Amino acid sequence: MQEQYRPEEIESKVQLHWDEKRTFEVTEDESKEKYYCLSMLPYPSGRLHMGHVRNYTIGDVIARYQRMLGKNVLQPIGWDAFGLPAEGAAVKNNTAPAPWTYDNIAYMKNQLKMLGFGYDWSRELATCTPEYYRWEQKFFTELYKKGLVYKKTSAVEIPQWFIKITAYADELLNDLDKLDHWPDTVKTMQRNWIGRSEGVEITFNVNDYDNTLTVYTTRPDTFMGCTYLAVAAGHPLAQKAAENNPELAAFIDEKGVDTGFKAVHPLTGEEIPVWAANFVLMEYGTGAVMAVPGHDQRDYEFASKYGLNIKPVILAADGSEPDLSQQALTEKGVLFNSGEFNGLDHEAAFNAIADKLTAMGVGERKVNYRLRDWGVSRQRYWGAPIPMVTLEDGTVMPTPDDQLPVILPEDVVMDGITSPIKADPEWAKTTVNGMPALRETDTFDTFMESSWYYARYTCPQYKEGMLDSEAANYWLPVDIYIGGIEHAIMHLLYFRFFHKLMRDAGMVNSDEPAKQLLCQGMVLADAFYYVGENGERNWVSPVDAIVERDEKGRIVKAKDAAGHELVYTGMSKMSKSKNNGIDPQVMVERYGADTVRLFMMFASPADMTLEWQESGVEGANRFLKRVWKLVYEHTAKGDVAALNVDALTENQKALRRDVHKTIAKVTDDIGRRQTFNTAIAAIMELMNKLAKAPTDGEQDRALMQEALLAVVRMLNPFTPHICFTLWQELKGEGDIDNAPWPVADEKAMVEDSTLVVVQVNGKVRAKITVPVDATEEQVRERAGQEHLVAKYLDGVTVRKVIYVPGKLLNLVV
RNA sequence: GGAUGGUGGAAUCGGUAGACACAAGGGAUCCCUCGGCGUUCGCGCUGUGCGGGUUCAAGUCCCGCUCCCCA
Ligand SMILES: CC(C)C[C@H](N)C(=O)O
Ligand SMILES: [Mg+2]
């Protein structure tokens, strides 16, 4: 064994062994319990950033741990390879999107291998390849035949293809209650985004107008407080009046403008004015609202700006008429100033007033949803072509199966204005049923590829369909999905929906794609800036800052190499703007992958923010050098005898108890609690003890052998290169990757003594060690033999005692 | 959601606050030491943002407070 730990001499050799032996390649083995650990696949942007390293380190810890528990673990990797960034870069360089993408994949693939993530590389997918995207083209035609896809002109104004996600709204909503192992914050975000609401549609007659006008409200209980109506800019009434009204005609093309039209409030008989307003969405509900400025903030502002009546109809929480001098009272409450409805509380008032309007035939209950259909068309080159075609006679139909995939041409030259498949008017020309035809030139929203990759991983070379259901149903649902909270209302909603569409096409037999979602925290770093003589802030990398600390270590002044004085702004999100990014490649090359992985798992709980500190990375590196050292010194003395567990000293028994208690804690921390920082802390604390243990007698050496074999396994999911090597040095059986996770020996953990905390009136006065089965009377006796306790008992009376067996004695005195 | 030492963080049915690490400072990569005040080196007093309550006992439970356009 080498005396020096040299990650450069170890990491690449171990990594080649994983490739040569295909260690992490797995099949659908029905004799093993499966575990599917998935991390969100990266965009091939150029290089890994620290958030990738944290995300993928967390998955790999879990994947390697679950393998050591004896599960059959799938951990796949791939590339979300279409999208805008490659078009930018093709343009800026001499190039095309494809070759730039493929070069970035190679480079980042190598980075991921250098970090030693145990991926099933045989299942690696790049989404920009036709062997991948053909299936989303085929599935899209299937969706179209099922009635779930349509074309419409909208604005986000050009024609677009839409998938009917609103047909699954109620299921996407209901199923949130099955996702106990998703964070509440993500579930709340999706609930709010889907935005189901229960309201009322209300119709008014309008003076001098051939039609009625209808609004949607979730607050019909405030209807007697309605002093005006507001319509969206592009509303047919708003448009009708704008014909004989310059001001309004002027406004539609851009706050509000009086239509001049008067609506008849149907409960009070009063005429109220109809405005056109910019806060009223033509797309949601009817594109018109009944304005209640006393009780909706937005209506409150509009009324104020135009001097419209503000009428109070809801009492304050304490029963008092509200102060609307400042703002709306939005709190639901008891009605007043509302005729027959006065005194009714919210729920009663909602239903009373809905019932009346329904009976009068001017309103009705209505469920609306904020969720819109999913616009999947993009006027961009670097994406999967939409498999639709237009015949000469005008009929739009799917691309015929015998012309799928519709291949995006990769050898193109970009001009930066127009898509090459759009600029070359020959590309669109095709033949269907003899009759000539035009194929769609738009490409899919890139969220298309990421919405099903997690399923394709289960059968990545299957040629007979998007999925081989037997394989998909073996692996799915994903057991844990790791990726950031920022995907909550886009990818994390789309992948739920696409799972359900695949279920309903018969391809999978489960309702939800992932059991647990773990959202890892952001990685932060110190940020500094100086003010140039031009008054501009120039941000200086903490890498490049020279701080100087006070007597206790607080930063109290700082400069760059150029002598500029720096203001310290604390820890912040890594970015280009603040100049505080840390390149993970530099740190892997400086310290080795194992150091980097360990620091990132150690520094903070996975779901909390992580503060990068090079001094912590250095600390992680030193710890690994201490582990290396202990194993070097122990293995230098050769083979060990069998441990004799019955003849151990009390000191030996305590160290062994510490080894096994550590096994139990680290097990519970990694597997149940998912607190990896405290797992590592427990291993460090044990390692400190082990470094102080004798190692000359045969028994001391057998005990050390057992401890080190346990420690190297426990560290392995974090630092697998060093551990792979240390295990061989210890003469552990086979490769560490398939060694069993240590299980704590209950006999080793039995205590023969226990520590009792002796309090006198609630305040600690001693801590005594007694035989483990000492009785309450014996503990008491012992407690009063302690001068430190007795001096608080001197000439005073014990009123009672509290005893928690083997733990605590409190003398109340 | 949060608030615990100079910092990151620990404390898992209320029961030894500050594990582990960093910074630090000192001594010879190994040993210590380390919340604050005092110390006869045994400990004592005090302490989890502030105020109150419950309890033999509160970081943990209760109440109040201060602070980081979808109709
Ligand atoms: C799952 C995808 C939307 C993830 C994306 N490729 C990213 O790195 O965030
Ligand atoms: Mg503080």
Separation of A554 CA from ligand 2 center, angstroms? 13
Say which CATH number the domain at A187 has.
3.40.50.620
User: Cα separation of A18 and A269, whole Å?
Assistant: 81
- The Cα A131–Cα A407 span in angstroms is 10
Method underlying the structure: X-ray
Query: Does strand B come within 7 Å of the CB of A351?
Result: no
How far is A674 from A678, CA to CA, in rounded Å?
9
Question: Do residues A65 and A680 make contact, with C-beta atoms less than 8 angstroms apart?
Answer: no
Task: Tally Cβ neighbours within 10 Å of residue A570.
Answer: 10
Which token pair is A29?
Answer: 């083995």
As a whole number of Å, the end-to-end CA separation of chain A is: 62
HSE value, Cβ hemisphere, 13 Å, CA-based, for A320: 4
DSSP string, A407-441: PPPSS----SSS-HHHHSTTTTEEESSSSEEEE--
Q: Looking at chain A, how many residues does it have?
A: 813
DSSP helix, strand, coil percent of chain A (3-state; round to 5): 40, 20, 40
Across A293-449, where does the E strand assignment appear?
Answer: 363-369, 374-375, 377-378, 388-391, 396-398, 429-431, 436-439, 443-444
Instruction: Identify the burial level of A636 via C-beta atoms within 10 angstroms of its C-beta, where 0-12 means exposed, 13-18 middle and 19 or more buried.
Output: exposed
Residue that is written with structure tokens 């407080």 in the block: A225
Same domain, A532 and A648: no
Q: Clarify whether residues A487 and A569 are in a common domain.
A: no
Of A14, A195, A186, A202, nearest to A113 by C-alpha is: A14
- A307: CB partners within 8 A, 6+ apart: none
Give the side-chain half-sphere CA count within 13 A for A32.
Answer: 17
Close Cβ partners of A787 (under 8 Å, ≥ 6 residues apart): none
- Indicate the helix (H) or strand (E) that contains A352: helix A346-359
Query: Residue A153 contacts by C-beta under 8 Å, 6 or more apart in sequence?
Result: A159, A160
Together in a domain, A251 and A361: yes
- CATH number for the domain harbouring residue A333: 3.90.740.10
Question: What is the Cα A712 distance to its own chain's centre?
Answer: 31
CB of residue A692 closer than 7 A to nucleic acid strand B? yes
Closest ligand by atom to A488 CA: 1
The contacts of residue A84 (CB under 8 Å, 6+ apart) are A380, A382
**How many distinct structural domains can be found in chain A?**
5
Count CB-CB contacts under 10 A for residue A111: 19
Do A288 and A209 belong together in one domain?
yes
Residue A519 Cα to ligand 2 middle (Å): 27
In degrees, rounded to 5, the angle at the alpha carbon of residue A486 between the alpha carbons of residues A105 and A120 is 35
What's the DSSP call for residue A278? T
d(C-alpha A788, C-alpha A765), whole Å: 6
Separation of alpha carbons A443 and A426, rounded Å: 17
Q: Residue A506: which region, alpha, beta or left (left: phi > 0; alpha: psi -120 to 50)?
A: left
DSSP state letter for A369 = E
Helical (H) or strand (E) element with A160: strand A158-163
Q: Is A576 annotated as a binding residue?
A: yes
3-class DSSP assignment, residue A45:
coil
Owner of token pair 């999100």: A573
User: A561 and A423, same structural domain?
Assistant: no
Q: How far is the CA of A420 from the centre of ligand 1 (A)?
A: 26
Which contiguous run of DSSP H or E holds residue A33?
none
Unique residue bearing structure tokens 């944290």: A54
Contact A500, A514 (CB under 8 A): no
AA identity, residue A351: N
Task: Quote the tokens at residue A759.
Answer: 């309090």
**Bond before A605 cis per omega within 30 degrees:** no
CATH of the domain at A806: 3.10.20.590
Q: Rg (Cα) of chain A, in Å, rounded?
A: 35
Distance measured from the CA of protein residue A658 to the C1' of nucleotide B40, in angstroms: 37
Distance of CA A488 to the CA centre of its chain: 7
Cβ pair A588, A597 in contact under 8 A: no
* A148 and A92 together in one domain: yes
Contact A63, A37 (CB under 8 A): yes
Q: Which of residues 199-238 of A touch strand B (CB under 7 A)?
A: 199, 215-219, 232
Structure tokens at A475: 């692996």
| A208 and A354 fall within a common domain | yes
d(CA A397, CA A390) in angstroms, rounded, equals: 7
State how far the Cα of A750 lies from the Cα of A661, in Å rounded to an integer: 10
Q: Which chain B positions have some atom within 7 A of a protein CB?
A: 1, 6-12, 15-17, 19-25, 29-32, 42-45, 56-58, 69-71
Name the residue with tokens 């000439």. Answer: A795
- Domain final position from A731, A752, A773: A752
Q: Counting ligands in written order, which one lies closest to the CA of residue A517?
A: 1
Q: Which nucleotide is nearest to A757 (CA to C1')?
A: B16
Sorted by sequence, the CB contacts under 8 Å of residue A83 that are 6+ apart come out as A43, A382, A383, A446
- One-letter identity of residue A359: A
How many whole angstroms separate alpha carbon A378 and alpha carbon A87?
A: 13
Backbone φ, ψ for residue A498 (5° rounding): -70, -35
**Token pair for residue A336?**
């007043």
Ligand nearest to the CA of A495: 1
How far does the CA of A546 sit from the C1' of B68, in Å?
28
**Closest atom of ligand 1 to CA, residue A52:** 8
Q: What DSSP character marks residue A133? A: H
Is there a single domain that holds both residue A142 and residue A240?
A: no
Cα–Cα distance between A443 and A369 in angstroms, integer? 28
Eight-class DSSP state of A399: P
Place of tokens 């091939």: A44
Q: Closest nucleotide to residue A669 (Cα to C1')?
A: B12
> Is residue A806 within 8 Å of residue A755, measured between CB atoms?
no
Q: At A278, which amino acid appears?
A: N
Tell me: do A175 and A211 sit in the same domain. no
Given resolution (angstroms): 2.0
Domain CATH number, residue A536: 2.20.28.290
User: In whole angstroms, what is the distance from residue A58 CA to residue A717 CA?
Assistant: 10
- Please spell the DSSP secondary structure of A771-805, one letter per residue: ETT--HHHHHHHHHH-HHHHTTTTT----EEEEET
Domain identity same for A377 and A502 = yes
How far apart, in whole angstroms, are the C-alpha atoms of residue A38 and residue A457?
10
With CA of A291 and C1' of each nucleotide, the nearest comes out as: B71
CA distance A781 to A274: 88
Atom 9 (ligand 1) nearest CA: A42
Who lines ligand 1 at CB under 6 A? Answer: A 40-43, 80, 450, 487, 491
CA angle A84/A85/A91 to nearest 5° reads 95
- Which is it for the CA torsion A141, A145, A146, A147, positive or negative? positive
Pairwise CA distance, residues A718 & A741, whole Å = 13
Same domain, A501 and A573: no
CA of A222 to C1' of B71 (A): 12
Helix (H) or strand (E) holding A587: helix A584-591
What separation in Å is there between the alpha carbon of A85 and the centre of ligand 1?
13
DSSP string, A166-233: GGGHHHHHHGGGG-TTS-HHHHHHHHHHH-EEEEEEEEEEETT-SSEEEEEES-GGGGGG--EEEE-T
Q: Measured from the CB, is A812 under 7 Å from any atom of strand B?
A: yes
CA–C1' A360–B63 (A): 49
Say whether A466 sits in a helix, a strand or coil: coil
Indicate which residue's Cα is closest to atom 7 of ligand 1: A42
Range of A9's domain? 1-31+580-752
Which of A313, A339, A368 corresponds to the end of one domain?
A368
Q: Which of residues 467-526 of A touch strand B (CB under 7 A)?
A: none
A689 with A655: CB under 8 angstroms?
Answer: yes
Q: Which residues of A in 357-396 have their CB below 7 Å from strand B's atoms?
A: 368, 370
Probe target for ligand 1 pocket from A38, A40, A128, A498, with the most ligand atoms within 8 Å of CB: A40
Protein residue closest to B15, using CA and C1': A808
Which of A579, A614, A643 is where one domain is finished?
A: A579
Ligand 1 centroid to residue A39 C-alpha, Å: 9
Q: Which two tokens stand for residue A3?
A: 């005396």
Same domain, A539 and A620: no
